[PDB]
Amino acid sequence: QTPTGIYYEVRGDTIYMINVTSGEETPIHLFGVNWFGFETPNHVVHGLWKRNWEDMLLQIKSLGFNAIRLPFCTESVKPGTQPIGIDYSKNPDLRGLDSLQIMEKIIKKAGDLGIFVLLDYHRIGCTHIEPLWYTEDFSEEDFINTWIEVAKRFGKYWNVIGADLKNEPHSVTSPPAAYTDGTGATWGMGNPATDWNLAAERIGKAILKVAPHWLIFVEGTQFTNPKTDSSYKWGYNAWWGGNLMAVKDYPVNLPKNKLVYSPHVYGPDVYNQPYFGPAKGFPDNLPDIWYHHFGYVKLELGYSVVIGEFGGKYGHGGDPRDVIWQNKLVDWMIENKFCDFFYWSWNPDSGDTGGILQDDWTTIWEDKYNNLKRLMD
Structure with a gap:
């Protein structure tokens, strides 16, 4: 059940930490940042120079x-x-x-x-x-x-x-092509070798056998299957790890008390999406887009949804609409109680988003941070 005394689980859309000896359960909220570098040629979190x-x-x-x-x-x-x-x-x-x-x-x-x-x-x-x-x-x-x-x-x-x-x-x-060519992830296509929903089940089953007290965070793919992506006007414009539209009809087959869906979502600094154009309704069109791509997984289907990356330059040598984008996403997360998240990134050395730290690795962007801090209170 747990090698540490603590067992994590989801009940409805909220994550809990359980002390297994005392029986006590406490809801937790993740006010999170990415600190990257172990996945790079440095083989260590960046900034330690x-x-x-x-x-x-x-x-x-x-x-x-x-x-x-x-x-x-x-x-x-x-x-x-x-x-x-x-x-x-x-x-x-x-x-x-x-x-x-x-x-x-x-x-x-x-x-x-x-x-x-x-x-x-x-x-x-x-x-x-x-x-x-x-x-x-x-x-x-x-x-x-x-x-x-x-x-x-x-x-x-x-x-x-x-x-x-x-x-x-x-x-x-x-x-x-991407649905059948074998080179990219799918969801709901049928082929267990490209279908991420099926693989997530295989990999999370294996981890839960050796770490039964853990949570399994499962991200979106980019495209899922043609019926699902075509059912929504912006179906073909979700982020990498960002498309959870297939969850409804193709839910990952794992215990609901151990599963967290974890979409990534980004603004104009990562890609100039057509829906970031004012002519197409920006920024007031966004809630509906987030809602279709991932937010219904929580608001309609009741799963925990923890946004595993979002971020951007917040107007510091980037597209100034990013400021508007990050405000509107934070407003929407607050309105809809998406209170668990990991901001991308702590590090400044992320070329299309910067981070909470500035290029000196010492001082924060006060404005980017103050906007995010609204989620923390």
């Missing part, structure tokens, strides 16, 4: 966040992988540690601060996000076995809440 790792976590907590989504790639979790680009005058207690041991130390430190950790298997290699949870050289079985290994080790950390099974299932060709 400019900051001490613990000070960063203190800074994160001081801003009211209580959760971190931690991307990793396969190699970062294998013992013996070396990190690159750490300033060790600033991080002397990292001297000698490989990527995995830095990950343990960070999660343990986060735990000491009450901060929840969502582990996110973000890339299989360490360069880019594959459309599928396998590659020519890395099979599904390999992918699953890595999760089992990660689950065995990190399931012993009280604050690790579970597994975001694969970052951004998506496509690399257009429809209608």
